[model samples]
Target: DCHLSDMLQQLHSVNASKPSERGLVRQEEAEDPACIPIFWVSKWVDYSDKYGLGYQLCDNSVGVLFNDSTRLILYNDGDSLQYIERDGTESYLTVSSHPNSLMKKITLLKYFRNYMSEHLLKAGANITPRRLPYLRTWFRTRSAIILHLSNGSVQINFFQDHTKLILCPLMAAVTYIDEKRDFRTYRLSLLEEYGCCKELASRLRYARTMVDKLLSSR
Candidate 1:
């Protein structure tokens, strides 16, 4: 029933090595997940036609932007809610107490949150999230799905190879959760002069072209 777990076990277990040069492979230090504002989104619901998009962040927040162009967040805290209007207005309320007008959308929000709670595995590290980043937009193809976050982070998840790449434009860093479930980061500017592992080089190649392709189409 859970084929994703099968793919993940395949990853929990490594094939290729990391960067060959020292200082090239970023690990425990320097721009760690804690240092950056990006929250790894472990789960995604792309029923854009039916709803808008649903995703669960590493911080355990369930956020969905409805097709009506409005959005809401149901924190794993269970009762807290952050709602946004299509006109860009905002409201901070709680599930235990909210305006009468929002009850309708509130119902759908909870359902999406509940669906993710039951169905999705909360992937990634246990970092305390700060900004409460929300989904901006997303696109999918047979090969992969790209998620654009409000905090200017782009996460690309590949289906065929079962890997993910997180791009932080602000930090100019690329974070790749490799096939072996290794979270390694590379600086965009430094890779050329310093050089990197053969494994990561190819991965960045794919990511670069993917970004270009996304650009041409968009």
Candidate 2:
């Protein structure tokens, strides 16, 4: 159990050291038949005792983090394992040769219905005509939501069983705005842009109403 505790502690240390960054941490216990991978990415990585691990599985670009010397990739091309470098270069590695690097991929069906339902607040006063329908589609179709932070955009993927995150460049429209309020305004812009769409205007208003109410309650 000490090894498990050490691994958990090390994962948190690395995560807290750089909260602005994102990565996946897989925890393996020697006595268990399988290991459960936990995500530590911003926006997407969430934890509450009520929900074991707030994520879903996706085959996204979540490169596994080890120590200072070794970084692992999540690629399997039928034969050899792969690794990605800081410069965006991809390379192959022999997994069997490195016993400490072995990690298993999880397979299962999952959803975030409870999370969404909680945020929507079934009987909110500012309810919109298309909000629930729009939210239903949003939740059912995607596993994760991408939030654009000041320095970089965070991508979270919800898979059938787990969640992962990747960092990318900010969108062009929001780049001109001051960094502090970019996230807040960008969300508004999204609703405005959606409103312009003839087919989705109703749904967008519905979603915006729910979002506004949810934020206000906090």
Candidate 3:
């Protein structure tokens, strides 16, 4: 099921349906730590030409989405690996064991893990265990790249503008990193309440459209 996509769709529907109440924002009487966020991504790099794509989640797990559409992942502690085949199957393996055919892919996975950890700074840390949601698919546009995670959270990064957005479908919340790199978050219901610029509004519209495409993808 498209968990985050449906969640996002409902959020947009609610706000848009009530043209009159179109969502409002107000300051809390006090800061509430009650609203911590869950992330589906940390750092990402597009090596789309020769390989596929790569990303590091908050918990330090690394996964590479390659040209063949199959995916390779390294677990948080680097003890295990998961290969999701192009035909909708997955297998569990170890760092030293794998099909002879996957040797190059394994090598590539190791490089991505090493490069990301050594050269990149992650987003939120101390995340979690258990089967956390992972990236399922992605689409790149002229101005940005859109990521769809297994858990349904959708993230869009606009390269030329130096801005980004993280949509938490379950919480109906959005975290927007503006051009200056300042991050602000608020429920979609309180969109107008927290208030924003035309740039945000415009981008959100496009971002919303992306959700539809994600829901339709494999």
Candidate 4:
């Protein structure tokens, strides 16, 4: 027969694991002053700075356009870096991915240019004060995304809009009146890149296709 002391020893909290010292931080943990019984360490580690932002301060002018011949070179390369065009003057800067040049301005601007330039070029135009419609277009929104946690759960959500387009009428400026949604439907494509979540990733993929069709129209 077991004694009362032996019974108590046999009973232990199964809910208790090695106890996530820092792992104590459970998902959806709140910042409430009430659950103060156990300490919560939000974020604790910082890695080497260089290992983070892998960018450098390289001369951007090496690829930018200045005059007619320079413009040819810039066009041949397909894109250029940070450029500033003012009253009959142009300047280029060696952009950095550092805080000062966050979001990889050089690379972003280059990609942005390529992203919209296809449309503008189709209309026989370039990015300038007069021709700005192409520059104004942007990804309406991040469509859908999915999240698959390490704990074996999944989430699915829109990565981009999968809805219809809207058109407004211009009464005074134009003599033509047209009713349509998105007319461009064959000029673009969407790639399904790896995402942390699978469900939401599927939704994003659909949205990518929708947007791609819009691009192809140009």
Query: Among all windows of ten consecutive residues in candidate 4, which has the lowest summed lDDT?
Result: 168-177
lDDT, candidates in the order shown:
0.67, 0.26, 0.71, 0.22
RMSD of model 4 against the true structure: 24.3
Q: Write the per-residue lDDT of candidate 2 for residues 1-218, one digit (tens) a residue.
A: 23223323332332333322214311111111111111112212232233223222122222332222223433323234455344445566554555443443111001232342244222111211110000001122343343222122223333443322222222211111111211111222222223222212222223333333323433
Candidate 1 local lDDT, 1-218, one digit each (tens): 12223222222221122233466554334234433445778887877888678888887788888898888988888889898888878778998886788888778777777788788765556334336877766778788888777776778888876778777666666677766676666554455435566665665555555555545554
Please rank every candidate by lDDT, starting with the best: 3, 1, 2, 4
Query: Which scores greater on lDDT, model 1 or model 4?
Result: 1
Q: What is the lDDT of residue 201 in candidate 1?
A: 60
Maximum-TM-score candidate: 3
lDDT of 3 by residue, 21-101 (tens): 325423232112333356557888788899988888877788999899899888887868888899969888887775798
User: Comparing candidate 2 with candidate 4, which one achieves the higher lDDT?
Assistant: 2
Best by lDDT: 3
Relative to the unseen true structure, what is the Cα RMSD of model 3? 4.0
> Candidate 1 lDDT (Cα, whole model)?
0.67
lDDT of 4 by residue, 129-160 (tens): 10001011122235432221111111222323
Q: lDDT of candidate 3 vs native?
A: 0.71
**TM-score per candidate:** 0.75, 0.24, 0.77, 0.17
Ranking by TM-score: 3, 1, 2, 4
